Amino acid sequence: HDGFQTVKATIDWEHPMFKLYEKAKRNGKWNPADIDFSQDQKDFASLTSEEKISALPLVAGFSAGEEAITLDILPMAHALARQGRLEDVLFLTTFMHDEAKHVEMFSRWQQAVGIGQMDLSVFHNDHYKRIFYEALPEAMNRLYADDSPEAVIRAATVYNMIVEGTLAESGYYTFRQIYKKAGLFPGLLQGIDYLNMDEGRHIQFGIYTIQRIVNEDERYYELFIRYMDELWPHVIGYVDYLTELGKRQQQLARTYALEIDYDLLRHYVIKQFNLRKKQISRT
Amino acid sequence: HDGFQTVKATIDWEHPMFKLYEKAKRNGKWNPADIDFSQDQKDFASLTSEEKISALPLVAGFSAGEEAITLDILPMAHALARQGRLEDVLFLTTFMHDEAKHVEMFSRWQQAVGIGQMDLSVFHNDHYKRIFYEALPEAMNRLYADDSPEAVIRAATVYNMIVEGTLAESGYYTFRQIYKKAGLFPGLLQGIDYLNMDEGRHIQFGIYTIQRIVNEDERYYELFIRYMDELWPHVIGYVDYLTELGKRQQQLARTYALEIDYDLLRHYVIKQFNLRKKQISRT
Ligand SMILES: CCCCCCCCCCCCCCCC(=O)O
Ligand SMILES: CCCCCCCCCCCCCCCC(=O)O
Ligand SMILES: [Fe+3]
Ligand SMILES: [Fe+3]
Ligand SMILES: [Mn+2]
Ligand SMILES: [Mn+2]
Ligand SMILES: [Mn+3]
Ligand SMILES: [Mn+3]
């Protein structure tokens, strides 16, 4: 270290990421350990085997995603720390702790309903793996040796704009469209509501990061759009795979009179993807 | 990634670091933004210039240390993440967020009392710089390329056993011995109480980390002792420098009838150092 900002000066109290950090502390008190999952255990046990499975693809996607994101944010925190972006780092401590609670929430649900011993990796197809097993850690880990604006934009695009701003947001919507209607899994849905609220700050950090780089040179806008489009095939290829699992196993939909509109879910994904694009201004 | 623990299985709910993570969430709700510093501003302004300075060396040491530690824990989190130690990572998200709040607390105090514009690096002598500007980032950053048991023990020794378990603990004691007696700076002392409570978990993570490595091969015990002793000269060399500043500027002690026992503070430092050693068992 050559010096310390809070010895030479203070935190930059007006910095957007300090304000986001402050909001994260105010809004981040929830604890997955307090969620009552006992009704969820009864719901899951009440289900037939073919209804039991209906929910597992989505939980498998979230549980791996939360865990990937918990591990893979560390290089972003490092890169920004090394750039002396102290307020970003303070905020990223809330981001990382949020994702830890997200991992915890889904794992507590799996334990409570009796599937913790079940290996849910069978529900990760090639497109999911390309995003979460490969493209996400590649883009983040790159920041250890290459913290160029190109690398940081690509990292924020994959992590915050695609994984969180497209897939996670759409998954929260899907959970609600399906189980909130069914009256099922109230503990899980309480957790989803807290995850979704945290996610708002995570996406805003991505937007801030990408926009501040675009702000220095509008040609980075083109890079942002390009990286969004490179991942789209895998995003929809996973969505299509989940859709086809749902269409092939309809008993939960039948039993609970959910006219599950998979083409409305698909449209919600397309819509999320397009509005994330629109939250980055070329100028 | 080759897979995900919370897809194949669950969190290891009995893991000591998951239990420490759970305690951190329960005990880590405090927010520096809620501390009332208005009485602290009046106290500081009431002081003469020569009393004003008396407190600044210690705040300078803490503010830089909190900031160093916030940046320099990231490689430990990374190394353990890459080892698949998921429960350690979950706990480290609380550790990192705690230190962010510590940075925030001291910087809020500096702002409130009117010294935020003052560059307090003048109170970092060569021994302080050797620990915080050099040895700490060197030991932590090494973990990016070398996560051997030797490297991890050395990192935990410098960070958790020396910086936190010797210097920080002794600084908390010193703040209380001096200002809690004077009736001064109630907001700062509220913050110190919260820092000290957080620190308990940070030191326990260090103990767990060092002991689990020693447990695999008792020869690492010798390394631990050696790394403790290598840093001791700098620890006491900074303590002696602070002591001599205090002896050379006594007006706060006089004004507030603090018979400040600098040789009792020195003994407290020696005692902390020796009991950290004793918390690691050769077997
Ligand atoms: C059937 C419609 C498809 C809806 C899309 C569902 C997407 C599943 C979500 C899995 C990825 C979750 C990523 C977590 C991100 C974070 O924790 O910030
Ligand atoms: C006059 C007696 C000397 C007492 C020793 C005072 C030591 C000052 C403390 C500065 C280091 C603080 C390190 C912070 C560690 C953490 O935040 O985990
Ligand atoms: Fe997120
Ligand atoms: Fe600490
Ligand atoms: Mn395909
Ligand atoms: Mn010396
Ligand atoms: Mn999440
Ligand atoms: Mn601290």
Residue numbers in the entry:
A (entry chain A), B (entry chain A): 4 to 286
Tell me what the authors wrote about this structure, in their words:
Crystal structures were obtained of all three R2lox point mutants in the non-activated reduced and the oxidized resting state by soaking apo-protein crystals with MnII and FeII under anoxic or aerobic conditions, respectively. In contrast, the bulky isoleucine side chain in V72I-R2lox has a larger effect on Y162 than on the metal-coordinating residues. It seems to have displaced the Y162 side chain, particularly in the reduced state. Both I72 and Y162 were difficult to place in the electron density. Aside from these two residues, however, the structures of V72I-R2lox are practically identical to the wild-type structures in both redox states. Interestingly, it appears as if the ether cross-link was formed between the hydroxyl group of Y162 and the Cβ of I72 in the oxidized state. Although the model with an ether linkage is more convincing than other models with different rotamers of the two residues, because the electron density is ambiguous, we used mass spectrometry to verify if the cross-link is present. More mass spectrometry samples were consequently prepared in the dark. The Y162-I72 cross-linked peptide was obtained by digestion of aerobically Mn/Fe-reconstituted V72I-R2lox, but only if the samples were processed in the dark, whereas the cross-link was not present in V72L-R2lox. Therefore, an isoleucine in position 72 allows cross-link formation, but makes the link more susceptible to destruction by photoactivation.
